[PDB]
Symmetry: C2
Amino acid sequence: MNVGIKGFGAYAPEKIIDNAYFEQFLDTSDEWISKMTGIKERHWADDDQDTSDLAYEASVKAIADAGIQPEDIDMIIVATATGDMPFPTVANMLQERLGTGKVASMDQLAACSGFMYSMITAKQYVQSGDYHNILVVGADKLSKITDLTDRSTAVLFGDGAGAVIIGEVSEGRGIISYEMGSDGTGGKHLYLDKDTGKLKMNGREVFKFAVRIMGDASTRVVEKANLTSDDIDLFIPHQANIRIMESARERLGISKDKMSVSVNKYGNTSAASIPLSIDQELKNGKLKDDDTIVLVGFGGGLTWGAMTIKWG
Amino acid sequence: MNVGIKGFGAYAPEKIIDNAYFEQFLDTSDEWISKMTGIKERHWADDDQDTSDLAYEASVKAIADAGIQPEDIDMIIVATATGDMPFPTVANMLQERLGTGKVASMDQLAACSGFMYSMITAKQYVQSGDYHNILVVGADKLSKITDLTDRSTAVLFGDGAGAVIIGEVSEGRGIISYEMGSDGTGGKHLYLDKDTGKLKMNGREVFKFAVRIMGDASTRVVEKANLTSDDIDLFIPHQANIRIMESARERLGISKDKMSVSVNKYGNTSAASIPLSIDQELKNGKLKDDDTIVLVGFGGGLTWGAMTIKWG
């Protein structure tokens, strides 16, 4: 069987925040932020728009793109680290808002690597032959856990969502190979502070891990796919920092005209970052049926994931 | 392929809370609590003992019982609605604490149905042929989210953890049939208040829903397994309420001795509920190799999950 993406959709909220905005209360500048992260703007959800709302906009587009009805969905999986509540989950809320049947729904937590973990999980279910159209979403409203007084993190995160329908795809297409991992010793380097409720990060430690793991993991899934860098049409890494992405790109061997870059317009959106990037490449005519791409991400945990996909 | 439980272990914390304890802060009596819930005592975790610690205790027991080494685990999945933090997850924390490889590790959220969802998830992975020893944990420290000013919920919840190693078992044994579902229109009846951090419940509505689904989902998996009520040695429901459980027992027309009951000693421990009950039946000599049992959980979301397993 060939399991792949039957439909795709992504969404970013209305309010756009440019770099200049942070100078009103932080010791920063457009130049500094651009130079250190590659970010120029980022999108923040309105105060009445939560993670579930972002997830729902991405999900309706992915369903429409798959050409199926909400009744065709047989499972909903949501990768998020910022769900509205622990229960009901964002997945539970989509079940009702999308009007699907009373199908299994659950959220999965693996931070920025969440979308990858969830697509792979969906693959397993579809593979069993018992599921045919699984809605997988990667959504996060990071503005909810950002500490605005911390210049290091305040300018990094944005809000957004991406969604796909995982199911059987035509011959040769789909998820070819994949890799998932975690390393809890790095937990103290990126975590949600218990009584502050804000993201705390050891930037240098996360930077070092990101660059090595994203390059290593990418190389492994390309080989397990029996391919080489030259066969990859698009390299789509978690969009956390343009300097991390560039290092990982080198360590991979792929040319820059082949790496998707969207961190400049969205900042870091955790689980939604790879899908938002995919959306741009689709809209700018850079990703086509039968193109071969490599998705790779890292995240708090620490966690990582990577996969090779034959598009269409 | 026959996939089942290769190892099992459970854990409840030291501090035992009797019914008489609440009279000092609420309008309660042991008679009232006993009649409304069936609970006599429940266990609460120490202030420096979080959900991950409860999960670690259950996990070491399951690994020993499976006869494997930590290095043998190739995936960790923790079902919880009270994880220490959204990232790193309890699963990430176990990866480090248990000393396993840098395996994929994630938390799944489906409230009190989480353990069932997670075991079924692990099954898909073992069935793909790529994983052989998956640690699934059901853990919760509800004492963290209980509103102590609300007599109706303050007296129902306890803390605990359960764990199993999912992998291949001998012919005929293991997970025979299953089902999972959800209905988000029931979200308002049981949820975590986003602003207060405490559990909110509409007892009447949850009672109605729980009785109906516990009975309905149980029937459905017994039939899917081509068995009948009589072929079932033990019925192990989520221990949410003795009234709910009996009402669902009477509906099943089954003997008191065919239903495991531990809510009297643990209260409602959400995702740990079923494993702590199984632990009791093993310890008391009521569950032995080749017995065929039915597990069925239901909870916030709303969600539910059920399965039939031939033990061993």
